[PDB]
Amino acid sequence: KTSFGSLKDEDRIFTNLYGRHDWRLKGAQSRGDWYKTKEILLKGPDWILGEVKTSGLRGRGGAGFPTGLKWSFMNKPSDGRPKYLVVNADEGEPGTCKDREIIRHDPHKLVEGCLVGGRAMGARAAYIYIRGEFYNEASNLQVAIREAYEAGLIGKNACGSGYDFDVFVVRGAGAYICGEETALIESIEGKQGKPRLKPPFPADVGVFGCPTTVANVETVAVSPTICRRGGAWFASFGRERNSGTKLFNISGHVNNPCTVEEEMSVPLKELIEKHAGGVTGGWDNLLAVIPGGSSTPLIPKSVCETVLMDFDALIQAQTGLGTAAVIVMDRSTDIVKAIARLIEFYKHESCGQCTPCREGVDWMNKVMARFVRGDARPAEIDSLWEISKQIEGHTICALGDGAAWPVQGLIRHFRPELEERMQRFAQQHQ
Amino acid sequence: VNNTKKWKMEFDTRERWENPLMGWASTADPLSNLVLTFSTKEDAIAFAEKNGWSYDVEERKVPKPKSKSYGANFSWNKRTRVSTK
Amino acid sequence: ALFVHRDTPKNNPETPFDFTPENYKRIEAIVKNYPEGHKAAAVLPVLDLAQRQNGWLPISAMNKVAEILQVPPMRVYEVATFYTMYNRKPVGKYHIQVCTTTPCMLRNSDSILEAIQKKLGIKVGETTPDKLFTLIEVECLGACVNAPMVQINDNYYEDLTPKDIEEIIDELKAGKIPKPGPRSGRFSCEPAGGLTSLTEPPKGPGFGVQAGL
Ligand SMILES: NC(=O)C1=CN([C@@H]2O[C@H](COP(=O)(O)OP(=O)(O)OC[C@H]3O[C@@H](n4cnc5c(N)ncnc54)[C@H](O)[C@@H]3O)[C@@H](O)[C@H]2O)C=CC1
Ligand SMILES: Cc1cc2nc3c(=O)[nH]c(=O)nc-3n(C[C@H](O)[C@H](O)[C@H](O)COP(=O)(O)O)c2cc1C
Ligand code: SF4
Ligand code: FES
């Protein structure tokens, strides 16, 4: 296939994405969920890991690590310690609200994904670290887990396979940094959500000291559909090394902000004008698109005309795919006010552990707050660039990178607008 | 640790007393500020024996190599878990 | 907004806090979710339970969570001051949380923040004199396609106009509890002018299942 997009409704993983069907167990089993789960479990860990490696599933959390390669880090003998699958249901990214829709509307798909994935990785239980702000979704998920226990689908002799597997839900308490997998581990362990250093990776030392795989809600929930439909079905969508389907959250300055499941390498312009009704005021009213939530660099209108919405074509467009959360910004936007608000978010959501983020993200927020007013000089733009290059790569987790990249995208694509802002400040205040 | 690299020869501290006029530290010891620097211990011993100085040597106290592990802060069953970070 | 504690007469280690016995059974069920020997992993739920029984956290809820989990009290103080939900001051009975990040600021959450301010007569951080409404300004609540939106105590009120949040505040003052949903026409997250996808009926069990399973 050469052009991508226009996904059919029969080829959807997240049926009942919109809350239009029964999310409970009798509705979920009537939509293909929990069907032949025992036959998936009995074929061993190696078969399930091979079906995930065949499918080409990458990490839907946003970094895009190969999911089968990541989950095969647990295919190793027991050293006395138990093993844990941990579902990352935090979703603190601005723009991103897809995991809320999975937990709220397809919860049994997440529970079956916990069972199948923890069977693949030999795990003992599933700790679903859900966001603390998602209370109704957490009780929603707990109702589904009660329905899964009472049907014998999980717990003692899960689905009649002789495999014991629990599913726990831990609520967060209001920290974006607790979506980072090691800080999420530290938050489950009852401490401040500060990220660990790597190595040890969580497959070696994870939650409680155990072998542990943290994986996103989407990359876990699509795994029983990969096991039932086959890995080649999932690899038959999107470009090569960009396989599958993907949830997209188009918000901001579009006519109909919405969540949509779409084929992987869909064009951005087609996605916006097909599922969201296009940019408000027309496509010529488009100023910028933050393609994948707040951490990715923005791209202007001259990149959004031709770009594909997968990992590799956005890396080649000097941005990232991230969480596939499309924030659309029209010509009426003070883009410096939006990016400075985004940097303000990253200094409010920063755990204070290491030096470059703790100091430099606040220092970038002060510089961006002066750039909104134009209370600066153009030699501070390049300086700000250097500050971002001192935060990027030198921090413990990638929130320093995710704070550096909006600054770098704004400078790289809108340096003249910053310079005219500052020179008009200078000529109206002197 | 750059000040712990070379051997040093000092002398026994003699009396310091108070100046009656100003309150300064008066001394009568000519060798009170004499600190000599040597690459090895035996050069220092040879320079002391060459000058007729009764010496005493303290051996170099080197720090022993510790076993450092970051994941040991997050153990399953050991007491070396950190309670915070 | 501070991160050191000073003993007021209403916030001290002699302030009366204690769990109800049904909350003690809830704490037992919480601590049974974690391995034997990692009871400190129950700091974040139980302390949040102390915020649900009491409304806020004095420094007797923190010391009680420290005592019943056999953890040092500083390890509960760190959790209480790290995570933004734990109210270390008493808030109003309805805790209005306006999201003002970029996907909601682009869809005019400023007008709704102004509407709540000019309605309640307060500003951000202040509590109304009847102690019913506390207005603060929070980061991304994770409902970005339903922007603009607020959170009140469990609930997301989404796709709001200033009239809609005025009406929600009017019926919160009247005692009723509103419906946590988008105040526009749509239901959860669909496109607002009809479904662009998932119009066909879902297939059901057995569809597309590979051979050898
Ligand atoms: N979904 C959301 O709400 C948010 C998502 N993000 C995304 O998070 C991304 C950053 O995530 P990170 O995990 O920090 O990036 P990445 O460097 O670490 O790693 C991604 C995954 O691969 C695994 N991995 C990579 N190399 C490995 C190795 N050698 N051995 C074992 N495991 C290995 C890691 O355990 C991790 O789970 C950003 O690009 C952003 O798009 C950021 C903020 C919020
Ligand atoms: C600051 C920060 C916040 C993150 N928040 C989340 C999150 O909320 N949800 C998520 O699934 N991944 C989040 N991630 C990505 C995780 O580190 C991790 O890659 C992912 O949760 C699990 O891997 P996966 O993508 O294969 O599922 C975050 C990363 C960083 C650096
Ligand atoms: S860079 Fe920021 S988010 Fe990461 S460990 Fe340091 S303080 Fe935490
Ligand atoms: S930006 Fe307001 S909910 Fe995500």
Side-chain angles (χ1 to χ4, degrees), chain A residues 59-61 70 88 90-92 179-181 214-216 219 398-399:
Chain A
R60 305 296 186 191
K70 181 181 172 180
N88 190 346
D90 193 80
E91 202 184 21
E180 200 277 334
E181 64 173 6
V214 177
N216 194 9
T219 185
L399 189 148

Side-chain angles (χ1 to χ4, degrees), chain A residues 114-305:
Chain A
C114 289
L115 181 60
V116 171
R119 181 69 180 91
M121 67 187 68
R124 186 184 181 276
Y127 287 99
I128 300 170
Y129 188 84
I130 199 165
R131 188 172 183 172
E133 280 93 358
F134 292 165
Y135 182 76
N136 295 321
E137 292 82 3
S139 299
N140 208 145
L141 182 60
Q142 282 289 106
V143 172
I145 293 163
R146 183 181 64 189
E147 289 177 348
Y149 278 114
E150 290 176 353
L153 296 171
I154 58 172
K156 183 68 180 294
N157 194 2
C159 293
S161 68
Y163 184 76
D164 292 331
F165 187 77
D166 290 330
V167 174
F168 300 101
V169 173
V170 177
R171 285 183 64 247
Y176 165 70
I177 190 51
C178 291
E180 200 277 334
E181 64 173 6
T182 54
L184 185 145
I185 283 170
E186 298 287 312
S187 182
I188 292 169
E189 292 177 353
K191 290 181 282 183
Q192 285 177 343
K194 297 193 172 178
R196 297 179 181 178
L197 278 74
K198 294 181 183 180
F201 292 96
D204 292 328
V205 177
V207 69
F208 308 114
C210 298
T212 296
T213 292
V214 177
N216 194 9
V217 181
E218 182 184 359
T219 185
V220 164
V222 302
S223 61
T225 308
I226 289 170
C227 293
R228 287 192 292 273
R229 302 290 298 274
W233 178 73
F234 192 79
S236 65
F237 297 102
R239 293 191 292 117
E240 190 172 0
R241 278 88 62 188
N242 288 313
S243 299
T245 65
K246 183 65 178 65
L247 294 178
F248 292 93
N249 295 310
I250 301 99
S251 65
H253 289 164
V254 289
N255 289 316
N256 297 317
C258 65
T259 303
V260 57
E261 185 177 1
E262 189 68 30
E263 191 174 359
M264 192 70 198
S265 295
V266 63
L268 178 61
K269 179 180 170 66
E270 183 182 1
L271 178 65
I272 291 169
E273 297 180 356
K274 183 174 180 178
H275 296 287
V279 185
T280 63
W283 182 261
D284 293 332
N285 204 5
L286 176 65
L287 180 64
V289 166
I290 300 175
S294 67
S295 66
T296 64
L298 59 88
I299 51 171
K301 183 254 181 64
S302 68
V303 180
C304 296
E305 186 67 29

Side-chain angles (χ1 to χ4, degrees), chain C:
Chain C
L2 292 178
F3 295 107
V4 292
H5 177 75
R6 292 178 180 89
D7 286 332
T8 67
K10 64 184 73 175
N11 193 0
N12 54 3
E14 289 86 5
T15 301
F17 182 79
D18 186 70
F19 292 103
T20 63
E22 63 271 11
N23 288 119
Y24 282 112
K25 291 183 288 293
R26 290 184 179 96
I27 289 167
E28 291 178 355
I30 288 169
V31 176
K32 282 176 92 287
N33 299 123
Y34 301 106
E36 296 292 324
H38 296 90
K39 191 175 180 181
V43 163
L44 275 79
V46 171
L47 190 65
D48 181 72
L49 193 152
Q51 194 179 2
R52 291 183 180 272
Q53 176 177 356
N54 201 4
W56 65 286
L57 294 179
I59 190 160
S60 298
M62 301 177 191
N63 291 322
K64 185 62 69 177
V65 167
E67 192 271 332
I68 68 173
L69 291 175
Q70 285 83 19
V71 299
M74 191 65 208
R75 305 295 178 264
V76 183
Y77 299 159
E78 291 175 355
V79 171
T81 59
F82 184 78
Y83 294 94
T84 57
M85 290 182 186
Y86 295 117
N87 296 118
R88 298 177 290 109
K89 293 183 187 294
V91 298
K93 190 168 75 70
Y94 297 110
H95 188 270
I96 299 169
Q97 295 178 355
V98 182
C99 179
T100 58
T101 59
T102 299
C104 288
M105 187 182 71
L106 286 170
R107 293 185 66 84
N108 199 4
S109 66
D110 292 330
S111 67
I112 293 171
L113 180 59
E114 288 176 353
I116 298 170
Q117 284 175 354
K118 68 102 171 181
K119 181 65 181 296
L120 295 173
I122 63 168
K123 60 184 70 177
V124 177
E126 293 181 354
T127 306
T128 60
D130 56 354
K131 302 293 188 291
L132 292 182
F133 295 99
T134 297
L135 176 65
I136 62 166
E137 179 178 0
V138 302
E139 303 296 324
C140 172
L141 297 173
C144 307
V145 303
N146 296 114
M149 53 81 62
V150 300
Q151 181 181 2
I152 297 167
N153 297 321
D154 277 326
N155 290 316
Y156 286 177
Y157 297 99
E158 296 174 353
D159 284 327
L160 301 170
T161 65
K163 181 176 71 68
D164 294 329
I165 192 64
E166 283 174 353
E167 185 172 359
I168 291 167
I169 290 170
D170 285 332
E171 60 191 358
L172 284 176
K173 292 193 290 182
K176 296 179 291 296
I177 179 70
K179 301 291 180 66
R183 299 293 178 181
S184 67
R186 67 182 179 180
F187 294 105
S188 68
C189 71
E190 63 269 19
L195 299 180
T196 62
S197 68
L198 294 177
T199 62
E200 298 296 324
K203 294 293 183 182
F207 182 76
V209 179
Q210 61 178 351
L213 182 63

Side-chain angles (χ1 to χ4, degrees), chain A residues 177 194-195 349-354 357-358 395-400:
Chain A
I177 190 51
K194 297 193 172 178
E349 301 294 329
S350 175
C351 86
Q353 188 176 4
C354 74
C357 170
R358 180 185 67 248
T395 54
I396 295 170
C397 80
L399 189 148

Side-chain angles (χ1 to χ4, degrees), chain B residues 17-26:
Chain B
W17 62 93
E18 186 175 0
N19 194 10
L21 182 67
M22 292 300 287
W24 293 336
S26 297

